[PDB]
């Protein structure tokens, strides 16, 4: 009875916290248009349907979003996959050349300024002997003045040759389902009120994650995942300021964004099999790209998040908002890609408020660069191809990214300011629910049995 | 609907309960442990790490007495210096996650003793068939 022997059970449900690689899998809707239409049409397997999202009881696991893995590898995965869709495309060695620029035909003012430069330049032909003269349109943010006449040059030519993206491939987001290989599991917190740090009381395992689309944006992340009922703020340590503050709200704010100008693309043959898609002529009115949001929905959704923010700071606290403090371009504004073209849109028009402790719309104007320098890589740029026609897109603003000003000296006002900074804080808004554990079977246990001879 | 009783037979469904759930589910976790251009290289090395990890465990059962029984039983007595507990309280009051930490301060003492006991039993069995 008390002469207990031991038995080793194999296959015992028990795990540890570990770190491993994952495996992407994309849905069948992205395979209906094929042959390098978007990236990772070949890099991912097609999905199995409807993973075994089953439940688990009497169970409690502490999570973390901040020292979590699988976001640290995804920022490497998307960059490493982003580089692969460029190397089959054209280099721009023959185009870093002297430019002869002038103003576009427009009623120009003395104080205010134009934003398009009509530039002509020498260029090679398919043949090597002959040359040609050809012209295009460019933005103010891509030419600098080399130093009567006034001749320009491109901006990135003193640091790196540039890669034109092929116009066949698209940059639109697609669903990506990560999956764990054999011998691992993915747990998912299913709690309602859960700030992302600390023990979740109702976990549920799953085979693969749900729909995770990759977007790119610094402030005001787009097409995100909605909150369940309330509006939730999340942070690592709110009394600290150097960490960002993720704000995820419930009712999505619809945002319209457009460029009303009408383009024309114009192919220039550089050599054999080379095609520089320059901008042709602009038909109609030279107008500025802009975005609209609704006034009342925004005044409401700030009223929700102030009610949520006052829980951590005392009820008697002045909360106000301000424009971004400064820096480079694509962290003061907010950026996004709208059907193959990148915007940079001033957002002073939203964060001009204060909040006491008791038909119209908002327009906000944008700028358009053509070359990007994403992830601030030392040997990289990307000339984007211009696209035809009047362009617009509709999106759901879903979360904010904030930063407190950490001032000393006896403050009741606790001002907040937007800021993008790292790209990973986009991603942590998506993978905060999951974690990866490693099954270790073959437990061992005393019981009352003895193996005979 | 699918009901409550289906997740009792799901993968890792018995993890939250006591051993009585885990006394019957052991085929499922054993089943899902195996079956699963530079991306092909990374997933290929993940797959071979998975099967190498499996085959280490089949080897480590092979050097013990139980080859593929999946419910072993063997011949070292349980030293009560570790447990210090009554019988059914580790059969009805505890979970396997809870059982993990109480035997995590010490390990491979048990794995050291099992190899020695099986090697000794094979020696005495070789003597028994040697006189036979």
């Amino acid at each position: 009875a008390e002469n207990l022997w031991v038995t080793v059970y194999y296959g015992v449900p028990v795990w540890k916290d570990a770190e491993t690689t994952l495996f992407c899998a994309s849905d069948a809707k992205a395979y209906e248009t094929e042959k390098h239409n978007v990236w990772a049409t070949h890099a991912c397997v097609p999905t199995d349907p409807n993973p075994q999202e089953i439940h688990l009881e009497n169970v409690t696991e502490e999570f973390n979003m901040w020292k979590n893995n699988m976001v640290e590898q995804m920022h490497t995965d998307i960059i490493s996959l982003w580089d692969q869709s460029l190397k089959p495309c054209v280099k721009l060695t023959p185009l870093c050349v002297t430019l002869q620029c002038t103003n576009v035909t427009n009623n120009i003012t003395d104080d205010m300024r134009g934003e398009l430069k009509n530039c002509s330049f020498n260029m090679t032909t398919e043949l090597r002997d002959k040359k040609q003269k050809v012209y295009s349109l460019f933005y103010r943010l891509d030419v600098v003045q080399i130093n009567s006449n006034k001749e320009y040059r491109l901006i990135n030519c003193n640091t790196s040759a540039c890669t034109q993206a092929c116009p066949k491939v698209s940059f639109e987001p697609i669903p990506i389902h990560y999956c764990a290989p054999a011998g691992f599991a993915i747990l998912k917190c299913k709690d309602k009120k859960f700030n992302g740090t600390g023990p979740c009381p109702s976990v549920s395992t799953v085979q693969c994650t749900h729909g995770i689309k990759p977007v790119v944006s610094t402030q005001l992340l787009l097409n995100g995942s909605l909150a369940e009922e309330e509006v939730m703020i999340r942070s690592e340590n709110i009394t600290n300021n150097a960490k960002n503050i993720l704000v995820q709200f419930n009712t999505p704010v619809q945002i319209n964004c457009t460029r009303p100008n009408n383009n024309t693309r114009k192919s220039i043959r550089i050599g054999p099999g080379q095609a520089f898609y320059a901008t042709g002529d602009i038909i109609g009115d030279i107008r500025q790209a802009h975005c609209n949001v609704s006034k009342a929905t925004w005044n409401e959704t700030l009223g929700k998040v102030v009610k949520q923010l006052r829980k951590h700071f005392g009820n008697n606290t002045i909360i106000r908002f301000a424009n971004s403090s400064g820096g480079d371009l694509e962290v003061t504004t907010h950026s996004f890609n709208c059907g193959g073209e990148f915007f940079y849109c001033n957002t002073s028009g939203l964060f001009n408020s204060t909040w006491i402790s008791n038909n119209d719309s908002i327009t906000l104007p944008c700028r358009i660069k053509q070359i990007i320098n994403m992830w601030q890589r030392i040997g990289q740029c990307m000339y984007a191809p211009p696209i035809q026609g009047v362009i617009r897109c509709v999106s759901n603003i879903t979360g904010l990214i904030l930063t407190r000003d950490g001032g000393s000296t006896n403050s009741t006002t606790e001002t907040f300011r937007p800021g993008g900074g790292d790209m990973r804080d986009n991603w942590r808004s998506e993978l905060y629910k999951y974690k990866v554990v490693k099954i270790e079977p073959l437990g061992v246990a005393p019981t009352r049995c003895k193996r005979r001879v | 609907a699918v009901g409550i009783g289906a997740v009792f037979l799901g993968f890792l469904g018995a993890a939250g309960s006591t051993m009585g759930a885990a006394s019957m589910t052991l085929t499922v976790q054993a089943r899902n442990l195996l079956s699963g251009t530079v991306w092909g290289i990374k997933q290929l090395q993940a797959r071979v790490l998975a099967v190498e990890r499996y085959l280490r465990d089949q080897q480590l059962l092979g050097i013990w007495g139980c080859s593929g029984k999946l419910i072993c039983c063997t011949n070292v007595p349980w030293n009560s210096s570790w447990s210090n507990r009554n019988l059914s309280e580790i059969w009805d009051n505890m979970t396997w996650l809870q059982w993990d930490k109480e035997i995590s301060n010490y390990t491979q003492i048990i794995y050291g003793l099992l190899e020695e006991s099986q090697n000794q039993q094979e020696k005495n069995e070789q003597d028994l068939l040697a006189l036979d």
Epitope: N50, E57 | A1, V2, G3, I4, G5, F8, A21
Partner: antibody, heavy 117, light 111 residues
Framework: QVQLQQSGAELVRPGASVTLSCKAS????????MHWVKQTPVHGLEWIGA????????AYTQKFKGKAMLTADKSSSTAYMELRSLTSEDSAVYFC???????????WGTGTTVTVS | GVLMTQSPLSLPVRLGDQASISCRSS???????????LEWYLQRPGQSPKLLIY???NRFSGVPDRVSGSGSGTDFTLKISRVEAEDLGVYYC?????????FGGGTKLEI
């Protein structure tokens, strides 16, 4: 015979603990599931959870885990509740019921009115 | 949670006309094999709630040929072609994909 003979109307003083009884009949308990659904005028139909009576495999929601208990006696062939910390919102109408695995609700009982007063 | 959002609640429906009671879920209710398990309830004041449909479309045994469910993903609408006095009262939605299941708020058919 296929019935859910429940308990009676219960005018319960607050702070008390209620043992409900769902005498199901028509089949064995070992075949199929047992379930409990509330009825409040605030929400409509609410939840308690579910029980499997062969082993005692229980599940609940987040709202009532740690509040209610589900026990099943295999010999007496009854069901049980063990409520704790009865509140004014808990005054409801309880419907015992049955599911099969991968099927629907066969039987629906009378509904025990448990008022907390 | 996976709480259902019923639209609309109150429908005073004259006798002989049609009725449409939609639910919208927070997530997809796709069960892990392909067969979603949706259910629609009855309720009269003084009767236990009982089932009309146990699928997207396939119905409880004994239910007449006037009630039909349809929809996809999140949006799932009940449609009654001819409304009688038995149809009056509270209807609900129900999920079967993964536990814990959530009822709605209750949609009353009136006259």
């Amino acid at each position: 015979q296929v019935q859910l003979q429940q308990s009676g109307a219960e005018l319960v003083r607050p702070g008390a603990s209620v043992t409900l009884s769902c005498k199901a009949s028509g089949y064995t308990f070992t075949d199929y599931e047992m379930h409990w659904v509330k009825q409040t005028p605030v929400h409509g139909l609410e939840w308690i959870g579910a029980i499997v009576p062969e082993t005692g495999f229980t599940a609940y929601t987040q709202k009532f885990k740690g509040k209610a208990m589900l026990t099943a006696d295999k010999s007496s062939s009854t069901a049980y509740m063990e409520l704790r910390s009865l509140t004014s919102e808990d005054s409801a109408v309880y419907f015992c019921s049955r599911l099969r695995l991968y099927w629907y609700f066969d039987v629906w009982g009378t509904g025990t009115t448990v008022t907390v007063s | 949670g996976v709480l259902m959002t019923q639209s609309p609640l109150s429908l005073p429906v004259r006798l002989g006309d049609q009725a449409s009671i939609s639910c919208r879920s927070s997530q997809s209710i796709v069960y892990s094999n392909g067969n979603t398990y949706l259910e629609w309830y009855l309720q009269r004041p003084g009767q236990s709630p009982k089932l009309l449909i146990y699928k997207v479309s396939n119905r409880f045994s004994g239910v007449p040929d006037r009630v039909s469910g349809s929809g996809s993903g999140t949006d799932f609408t009940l449609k009654i072609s001819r409304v009688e006095a038995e149809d009056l009262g509270v209807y609900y939605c129900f999920q079967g994909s993964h536990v814990p299941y959530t009822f709605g708020g209750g949609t009353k058919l009136e006259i």
